[PDB]
Amino acid sequence: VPVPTGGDDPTKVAMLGLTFDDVLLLPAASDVVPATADTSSQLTKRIRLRVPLVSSAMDTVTESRMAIAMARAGGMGVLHRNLPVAEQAGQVETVKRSTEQFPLSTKDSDGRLLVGAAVGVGDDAWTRAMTLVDAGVDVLIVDTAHAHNRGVLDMVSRLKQAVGERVDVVGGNVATRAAAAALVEAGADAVKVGVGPGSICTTRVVAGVGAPQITAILEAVAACKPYGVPVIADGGLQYSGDIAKALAAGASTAMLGSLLAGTAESPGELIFVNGKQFKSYYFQDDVLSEDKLVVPFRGPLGTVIHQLTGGLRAAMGYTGSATIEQLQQAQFVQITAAGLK
Amino acid sequence: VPVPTGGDDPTKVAMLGLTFDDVLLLPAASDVVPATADTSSQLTKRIRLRVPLVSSAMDTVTESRMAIAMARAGGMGVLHRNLPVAEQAGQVETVKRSTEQFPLSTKDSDGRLLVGAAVGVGDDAWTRAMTLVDAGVDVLIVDTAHAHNRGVLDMVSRLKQAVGERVDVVGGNVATRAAAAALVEAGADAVKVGVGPGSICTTRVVAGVGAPQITAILEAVAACKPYGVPVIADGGLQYSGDIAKALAAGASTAMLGSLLAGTAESPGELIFVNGKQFKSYYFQDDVLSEDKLVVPFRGPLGTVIHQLTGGLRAAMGYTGSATIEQLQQAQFVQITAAGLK
Amino acid sequence: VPVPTGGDDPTKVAMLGLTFDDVLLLPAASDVVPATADTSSQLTKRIRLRVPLVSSAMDTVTESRMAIAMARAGGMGVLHRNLPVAEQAGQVETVKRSTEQFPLSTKDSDGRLLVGAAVGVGDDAWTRAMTLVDAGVDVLIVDTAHAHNRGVLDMVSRLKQAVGERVDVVGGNVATRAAAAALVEAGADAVKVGVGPGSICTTRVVAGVGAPQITAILEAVAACKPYGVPVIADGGLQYSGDIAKALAAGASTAMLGSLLAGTAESPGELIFVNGKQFKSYYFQDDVLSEDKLVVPFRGPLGTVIHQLTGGLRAAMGYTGSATIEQLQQAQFVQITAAGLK
Amino acid sequence: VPVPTGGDDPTKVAMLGLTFDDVLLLPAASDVVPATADTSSQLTKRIRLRVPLVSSAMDTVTESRMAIAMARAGGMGVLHRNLPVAEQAGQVETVKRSTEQFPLSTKDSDGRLLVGAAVGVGDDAWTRAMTLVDAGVDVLIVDTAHAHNRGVLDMVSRLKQAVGERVDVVGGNVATRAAAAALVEAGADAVKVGVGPGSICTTRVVAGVGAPQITAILEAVAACKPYGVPVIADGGLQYSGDIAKALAAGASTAMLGSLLAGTAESPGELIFVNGKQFKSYYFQDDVLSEDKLVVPFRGPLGTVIHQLTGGLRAAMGYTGSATIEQLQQAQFVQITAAGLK
Amino acid sequence: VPVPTGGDDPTKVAMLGLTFDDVLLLPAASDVVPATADTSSQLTKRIRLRVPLVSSAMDTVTESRMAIAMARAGGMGVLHRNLPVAEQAGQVETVKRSTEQFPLSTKDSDGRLLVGAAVGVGDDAWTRAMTLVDAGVDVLIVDTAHAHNRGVLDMVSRLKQAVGERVDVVGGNVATRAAAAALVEAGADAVKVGVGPGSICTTRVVAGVGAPQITAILEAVAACKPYGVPVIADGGLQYSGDIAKALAAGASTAMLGSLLAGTAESPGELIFVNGKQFKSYYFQDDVLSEDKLVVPFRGPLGTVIHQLTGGLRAAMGYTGSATIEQLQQAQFVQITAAGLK
């Protein structure tokens, strides 16, 4: 009768959570060379990217220059919302208002670059979303720290019903199967996954709330896959191997973030301190955001994207996956604590 | 229905992988003293060694001098292939052109020292293999980073059918049971095991692909033992205890590699920098090699081989194994994380 | 009769040597503001630079790009001679074949940029010098580690007699009054000063030969001033104050070297290693060069030249010198050991 | 004829310079107990302080609070001029608009506290000086980096002629006898001494200009003493022994600066960062100021002044000087570099 | 009359001593290429070496193997006396009982190698000296810590009287002109110079006795040069520059010691400790030796001697010295404290 970990309720400890360091990709029968692997993936139900990488809509990562650089590399940039509405709309216009140099560009029918923007929850969020839609945006991200709230679902449904034909809607951060199912029922075209995914993230330390990323992705995919809704792996990524693992768990796209924070195309001013290069620099109304609880130079973005895509191509070659849809069926091997030393 | 680690498919996480640090050899009834232990082992179905150790065909490890020294010590050296075909054939001939000093020498019917050579995949690989066979090479290694490819199996089958009576063919690196079975069916005389076997290997960090070595050896043995095909452990070894564990898990020979890189017989000139000695110095076309993703001094080879043999003999004495074929029937005990600190 | 430092020879220890850290510039009666001081100086008896800074003709410092940048900044670059003769002549032509962006450009009668080139000693050196002169070069530097040799003086005399009217000949490194007088008599248009001027230079540690830079400049100037020959202070500089002291000691132009090794315009590709920027890359026939005895990033060159010129202008304002020819009449104060701690 | 340090001019290195670390005070015949020593000394020819310490007129050191505290403790504060004229005049008024707690207070004829204000050079400097005179200031400091400029002397003469009968005029920073003589000829009532007195002062590193403080004070006193003009030592002081040495070289008052920066009476709000206490915070027209080239907490001001006065009293007792006028005749002993380790 | 450094006797502080770090060799007129520099020098009045280097007769430096290696390299080794007399005589015979490989070997009339041996003071020293002479030794060293004693002079006179024709006698360590003159009068064929020449030598710390090496050499040469007696510099050498400086001050041969302690030919067995290379190891009657007051690996001796000779040749080329006799006329420049940072 007693549970081995204590108590009488077997469901008090729901499940054992796996992170990126707990699993490795098993080699399989392969007829694919890395140079010919097709790394194209679905961002939403209507948009296909050439490189499954998306910027993280942070104020230190994505602006108009970063969005253009990401869109020309085959991915997409999502503009942050720590700005006045007019500033974000102007950044959207700057991205939109722009070929052997960048054949891999992601473009709509009109030939303009694709860009997304983040909107919060509320009436100001509604007017900001409408202004961004009229400015020519393509994807609307409902950037929330916890997307299982009723207000977030109401906003997602309202956006999908009002401007559903013009633009796509992406749900906020979730980490369970039930939350992903709720977002799918609300009408979202894509689901962003991750709630305190880092090992020592501030959400885990201060609030004591978190979810290991591999298990969270597998749970969200278990709810999103039958309906054709893509899953975006957000947070916790540290290497190209982590990106390959996230894509192999069922996610269709990876939101990079800290990898692109210190690149040249990121916002900030380049200065020299102690012989080392650095980048120097009200609307964050989210109650559960991390900043409500509590940069070094990395070079050009092209080399970073090249390294990440090379690692992903190597993983595809090892696992015998010619497409991302075939990489999503790859198997894992769980490693013990001795495998991390 | 829910899996304890997330998702619905119980085969998404195939198995838990054990490394060399997760297991220890259990003592058993013993009547064997370390000095009379029989350390002879099979390298292939037609070749038997006196010390089950082989150099790992790396450009910093094995050349003609290293091959001669390793064959005179009771094992065998495998010449690397980062060289023009003429140079590799010349080194093969130099090894062939050579008793109280070296009683344990491994020799063919003519009394000449045994040597192996690594080849690649393709038509250039075919002409290199034919040139090496003409020069009197004894073992051909189809050395690939991921040997479960179809072209690798075709190359192995062609070599086995053409020069089956002349030389023995050994398949590339594998990590699963299916790959080992495929290599056995292809006609290989021995199977080399290991894909990213190190804890911080570059294959794991960049590509996210790997396999713990103990589990990989147990899986490849489960496919190779019914046909009598020897299994060669490759990579992940750090001590003589790791060699004993690999031989007890089912492998018939351990491939040393980094344990011999800094020794005197390895290629490189001995120089002095900052008061310590160091060693100073087109054909690396493997698509999945670790080089595509990304040496100090160690003293004489004789002391290293003597220490490894002493450790193996101590393990044989502890486990009551008179021969390696009995050491392969030993039992493991699995230790927790606290046993590593 | 006995000398306090030992022996009976009062001239055994010739003199005490002062370095850049031993002296400071004394403030004097001033009516000069830093921003209106004239930093023009004579590089040779016929060439006048706008900023008295010249690159040091090292293989990691000055090539065509660096020479163009230096000539546009107001000084002059000297091309290194670690190249085949044809390549050096091609770089000379590249610099020669080229205004509110660069008002301070150093240009000849034809409006083309000035460039210098280094030559050695010998028949190969003679043919290299003739090839460079045929390419339109302006200043020929006899780059030798010790210019008091007879061969260097003979080469200088030959060049002055052959192409004296077209180009200017500059003698090699000297550190005494006698060598400076010998170079002046041989026919040099400018005398370069410094032999192991650094504190831990390889010449001092290995060969035991050296000369502090302030004393060396004062001695060479005592020989070169009566004949109007400018003195080029080469080596030992680490700050703009060092440049100010060198110009106040009597030198007319400073040769920079290590301060420009890792700048943008120096040769080499800008690469990233370990999260930090670095630069990636038969003719070293000098018998007495430092090479026979035994780079990181710095930023754009414009900021370096701005900082150095600002330091020199501040020094000119402090000492009350409206011209470099007036700065050469400044006085020093010698500081003790406690002034360095 | 040749000079031992190089050249033929014996006055190129004018003199050897001594800092505070190069000298120590020699004990002499004494009959003065520390508790009865008189520490009163002239600040100007008309104002006599009871404690010979003055704050250094910097934006991080002296404001109205600091000036009031210094005047209460027995010295005087000089208000910095990095302010609009109205703000500085208001601070002067605040200090003026203000007894067994502060027996040593320095007061004017009307019984108000004494305060000084620093002015620059120019017409704006003239209007600022006149506005501060109308505010009730007592001492006008012509704060410059190099006071041998003609404009500084002209400004001093103008101020002396205009407001001579009301307030006192103090000349800027000097480091030579000639500059002090020029200031005295201009009509200054006190001469401030020091041009880059620190070992690692930015003026020495960037401009190469400086003068050791002991020699500078001895030279300026050699000119100011025959005319009865006091000498103020500014910069380079780090202990009470340094204050004693400065006063013994002939100076009548020491300007502290960094020794008063970390006190609570200095501007800046006190907070706690990383377990340690710290302080938080157009008119900079001085062409040679340090800011044109390129804080911790220490407690109450009274304890710092007590410690410094105790050290000075101990020095007076050791040297047998009943008054400061007797301490200024004390002798020094010069120590070698071996006494600093 | 009062001395600047205290007292009334001007001869209390005899002289200012210079070490190797206080002087540098001034460049002079040169016509010597380092490849043709003649490094031949006198060891005694009847022995001329081809390389002026001698081992220091310490138990950790020189034995039979080291002596043979040094004699074949162009110099000479001196066997240490920390052994039984029979063992030392046997080692002398071993060296004696022995050519394109070693063209520069130092040889006697019969063509055998030259060796040296050290003796103490006393009757045991006399019997040891007689045994060594009967064993064919060529040079006898009266190895004492202080050679101005009457016993040392008596021993030298006795040896020169008894075996003057067959072998040469060398006096112990001296550091003054008077001691050198006394040894020369006693009849020594060479004078060894240095009494606590190290910077932190145990003699300087425990006994407080020592003399800087450059001054000591200049003083001993002042007494030895008129009579044609060579001077040997002992101790204090750390680099080839120090060797060049010692030979320039007037010494004819340098005794290496610590530079040859960790080589291959020095006594001590080669082993590995913590992954690092190391060496493993009643007659000490010297009362004033450092022993009464109180190794790592270096590689083959050939490279060490080659580097030292290369540095010496570089110094000879810089100073224009065709021979060592001409190098002894070179001049020094004295550097201040700032020349060592």
Numbering used by the authors:
A (entry chain E), B (entry chain F), C (entry chain A), D (entry chain D), E (entry chain B): 12 to 109, 223 to 405, 428 to 440, 448 to 494
Sentences from the paper on this structure:
Central to the purine metabolic pathway is inosine-5′-monophosphate dehydrogenase (IMPDH; EC 1.1.1.205), a rate-limiting enzyme catalyzing the NAD+-dependent oxidation of inosine-5′-monophosphate (IMP) to xanthosine 5′-monophosphate (XMP). Most of the IMPDHs share a conserved two-domain architecture consisting of a catalytic domain and a smaller regulatory cystathionine β-synthase (CBS) domain (also known as the Bateman module). The CBS domain serves as an allosteric regulatory module responding to the binding of nucleotide effectors. The enzyme is inhibited by both GTP and (p)ppGpp, which bind to the regulatory CBS domains and, via interactions with basic residues in hinge regions, lock the catalytic core domains in a compressed conformation.
The only extended MsmIMPDH structure was obtained from samples containing ATP in combination with the substrate IMP. The dataset of MsmIMPDH in the presence of ATP and IMP was highly heterogeneous, resulting in multiple 3D classes of MsmIMPDH octameric assemblies differing in their compression and extension range. Three distinct classes were refined: extended, compressed, and intermediate. The compressed structure closely resembled the compressed forms of apo and ATP-bound MsmIMPDH. The IMP molecule was only partially present, represented by weak densities observed for its phosphate and sugar moieties. In all our compressed structures, the Cys-loop, containing the catalytic Cys325 residue, adopted the inactive open conformation, but in the extended form, the active closed conformation prevailed, correlating with the presence of IMP.
